[PDB]
Amino acid sequence: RPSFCNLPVKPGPCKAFFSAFYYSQKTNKCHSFTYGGCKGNANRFSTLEKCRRTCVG
């Protein structure tokens, strides 16, 4: 997988309520999170299938 998949999930400090997905090295799976809308990192996807295409297979 791309190395940025292994960055830690980062909701950030803002409090908007964006639905998103991230990859976890613990599971080799994508999971949901709530992105607050600012200061995130690249382990963040708008859809489950994009997270999977990028990080899972």
Ligand SMILES: [Cl-]
């Ligand atoms: Cl998955």
Ligand SMILES: [Cl-]
């Ligand atoms: Cl797809």
